[PDB]
From a paper:
The dot/icm T4bS system of L. pneumophila is powered by two ATPases: The membrane protein DotL, which is part of the coupling sub‐complex responsible for the recruitment of substrates and their delivery to the secretion channel and DotB, potentially involved in complex assembly and secretion. Here we present the X‐ray crystal structures of two DotB proteins, one from the dot/icm system encoded by the L. pneumophila genome (termed DotBL), at 3.19 Å resolution, and one from the dot/icm system encoded in the plasmid of Y. pseudotuberculosis IP31758 (termed DotBY), at 2.75 Å resolution. DotBL and DotBY subunits display a very similar topology. A DotBL or Y subunit is composed of a ∼150 aminoacids long N‐terminal domain (NTD), comprising 6 β‐strands and 3 α‐helices, and a ∼250 aminoacids C‐terminal domain (CTD) consisting of 7 β‐strands and 10 α‐helices [Fig. 1(A,B)]. The main part of the CTD adopts a RecA fold and harbours the signature motifs of the AAA+ family: The Walker A motif between β7 and α5 (also referred as P‐loop), the Asp Box on β8, the Walker B motif on β10 and the His Box on β11.
Homologs of the dot/icm system are found in most Legionella species, but also in other pathogens, such as Coxiella burnetii responsible for Q‐fever, or Yersinia pseudotuberculosis strain IP31758, responsible for the Far East Scarlet‐like fever. The DotBY hexamer differs from the DotBL hexamer in exhibiting an ααβααβ arrangement instead of the αβαβαβ arrangement observed in DotBL. In DotBY, A, B, D, and E are in the α conformation, while C and F are in the β one, yielding an overall twofold symmetry. Interestingly, the two DotB proteins we have investigated have different hexameric organization, with DotBL consisting of trimer of α–β dimers, whereas DotBY consists of dimers of α–α–β trimers. The DotBY protein was crystallized without any phosphate or nucleotide in the buffer. Nevertheless, when analyzing the ATP‐binding site region of all six subunits, we observed a striking difference between chains adopting the α and β conformations [Fig. 4(F)]. In the β conformation (chains C and F), the Walker A region is similar to what is observed in the bound structures of DotBL and other ATPases, namely we observe an unwinding of the first α‐helical turn of α5 rich in Ser/Gly that provides space for a phosphate to bind. Surprisingly, in the α conformation of DotBy (chains A, B, D, and E), this α‐helical turn is present, formed with the carboxyl groups of residues Ser173 and Ser174 (equivalent to Ser159 and Gly160 in DotBL) contacting the NH groups of Ser177 and Thr178 respectively. With such configuration, a phosphate group would not have the space to bind at this position. Interestingly, in the structures of PilT, PilT2, PilB, EpsE, and VirB11, this additional α‐helical turn of the P‐loop is not observed.
Residue numbers in the entry:
A (entry chain E): 255 to 387
B (entry chain D): 3 to 387
C (entry chain C): 4 to 388
Amino acid sequence: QSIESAFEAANTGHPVFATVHSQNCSAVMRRLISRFDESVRGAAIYDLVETTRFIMAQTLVRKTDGNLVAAREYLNFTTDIREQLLSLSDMGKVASEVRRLVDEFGHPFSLEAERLHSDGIIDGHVAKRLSMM
Amino acid sequence: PLHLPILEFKTEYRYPSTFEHEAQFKDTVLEFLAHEASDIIIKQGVAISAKVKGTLCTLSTRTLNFNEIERIALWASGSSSVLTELASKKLINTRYEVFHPTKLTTGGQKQRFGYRVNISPVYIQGKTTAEIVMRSIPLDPLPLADIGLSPELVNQMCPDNGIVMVAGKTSSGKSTTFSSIIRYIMENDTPIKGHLLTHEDPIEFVYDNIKSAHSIIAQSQIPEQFSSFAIANQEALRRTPNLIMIGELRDKQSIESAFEAANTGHPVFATVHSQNCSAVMRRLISRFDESVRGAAIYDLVETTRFIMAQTLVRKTDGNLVAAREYLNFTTDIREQLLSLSDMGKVASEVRRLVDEFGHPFSLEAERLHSDGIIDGHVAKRLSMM
Amino acid sequence: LHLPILEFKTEYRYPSTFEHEAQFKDTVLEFLAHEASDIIIKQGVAISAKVKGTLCTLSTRTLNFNEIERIALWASGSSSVLTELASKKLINTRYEVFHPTKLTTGGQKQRFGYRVNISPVYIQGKTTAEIVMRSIPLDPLPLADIGLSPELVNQMCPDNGIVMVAGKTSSGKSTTFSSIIRYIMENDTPIKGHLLTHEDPIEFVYDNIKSAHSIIAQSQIPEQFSSFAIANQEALRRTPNLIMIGELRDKQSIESAFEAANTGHPVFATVHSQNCSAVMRRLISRFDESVRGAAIYDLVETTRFIMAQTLVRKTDGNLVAAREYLNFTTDIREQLLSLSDMGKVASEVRRLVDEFGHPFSLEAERLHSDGIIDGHVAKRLSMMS
């Protein structure tokens, strides 16, 4: 019911900011879809792709200092990306696709870990942990 | 000085030093109303602001203290226990009418503006207050020329049967479009005449002051008179309607019900939350499982007579115009979509068909921009959809 | 001065203000002189009726919410109906008007029968009722008129078990069942004796059906029994040879059907379902998983015959009933029982209707070959239902 209310607020023309307890963007999509039964699950996937504009996953990792930094995956849902997500003939794959697309067009946790690691903000170990997210 | 919301110059009033009385408050309200206000917001933290031209304007830099907002709150609520109720966690929505003395109607008596007033818990500088919000309530259906529609086009939108859909993100534009179309229906000789039911969320528009030779309208409120929209339609079948404003098509059951209504005798006006006509098609089709999806596409193509997506774009001038893309589902179009082989290309092909025979968003932006109304960039965005 | 059309009067002068029921019945009779089919009473406007589809009235004068109160009292079974309206109760009943001037029947008198919706509306800030009465056929229709073969309906009248006709609300299941009962008691059929019908709105009456072997009692279900559950509990207390129950809509209705059938009665049920498989699946879904096995067994064992039916418009422009049906024989039923998985029953039933029944595809083929439906219509029938 929360996810549906977010849908309606979005489609009634309003920015909706929402928090999700998932590890990463793929996990966000999959988790959101899990809420909806198979009978409604097509409609739900279409609503979710059509209304989503942007997905950020965050985690806290240890800086070389010992302080924490927020590493972020994000995918930005351009009209291109959403058009691509809709046209996968099987929607069981949507989540997977998102991953792919995040990898191709977004800022995956691997890329963020490379980026922190190049700036020396992060060790190799937590870099590896973080890419694995 | 500090960053501030915009203040338009006042009309017929000097700003109150402090909000002492409901007549002061009302005078502020109709000053706002001169600066045509979509909505008006009272919060203690900031000066009174209203949504003029879909932006936030404030009349003075002065910021109301909590007692001001308490008084205003008790005026608009009409209940002293308001914050008492707010701790009781009862949600407080009511109506607040303000009458502008000098203005009067075509006939009528005394000019009235309704507001829907929600009073909602907020939390600020460490504790609970109320925020008040007054949404202006549309007065009467606007003439079609007034809202940018030609009598011809709406003639297209007034079939003997089937489904006319208007599509958009915001409810205001749909309510306005369909209310205008219904007033035009009542006032003119048109294929669809007789009993007109509308199943509205907030009954936005009223038809008390629309003269009809041939037609009657019955309006029913969203939650409170009819619990469901399903309930309201199922009962609608019992009401010998000559046109059914169904409300939004959302779930499989809503659009199957719409199919039902159309496939008896009488027109159905539906709104859809999608950006353009192709998007309308694709979205409605989404509601249906693979196995049922063929039958569903057949029903959708055969029942549909006309699809309008509208948006609001900002003209160079400093105002908001409705951009409309529309396709009329004439028998040729319907046959062409039925003549498809995949039948899953119906969305694409509907796009193509809007390009060929409809009014695409690109053409609408080209015509708007060709005239003074919109700049090249907003025209670009408009064509993009 | 703009007005809907008003009739030339036959017999009576319009009341200054509606007070007595006899004025209202007289008005209905005036409308009937003009062969008026439906009547809308609403607050803003004069009492109107649809003559040949077009709205009309007996006077320019509008009605006060008071006389809409009165009229609502008269047409509806219940008293003080507005509180029932604010209780989100759906108020459909039936209303009868006997002809004053000794218009008599083939027998002794002549009566006119009305399906009365009362619906909540919103007028000028206030909740109201709109009333709509649709003249409805009084006597069940012969099989030939609704296109049923005596052989098939004999197929569908067991000594025991459940006969279901499924369909959309606007598909005239009630008509089918009324025809089937009239034929039941007019002909020599396996089912004879005391037949009870429980009808929300009672539509058809059997007062003019002479039977050699059977008596029929009809009970209206809001007004005479508070609930369907109560009426079915009471039905067994009586000595029924056939119980036309309600829609099978929730667990309790389905269970009442189970009880009636298992105490050795034909049970006639409607289901809100597009096809037979869909009927089975829907009924099974009503039960929790813990009880759903038992419920499935009961369902297959008590079912004797399943009809889904649609009204499809035919080449002429009029509409006829397409019917898919399966007869549940001992062999069919036991074959539904003897599955590795019972959750598959629905699927199976699909299969079975294709194999042993009259599927929608076959029905569309045979309608189309005899040139009843246009080919598009046949395709739609085959696609799903």
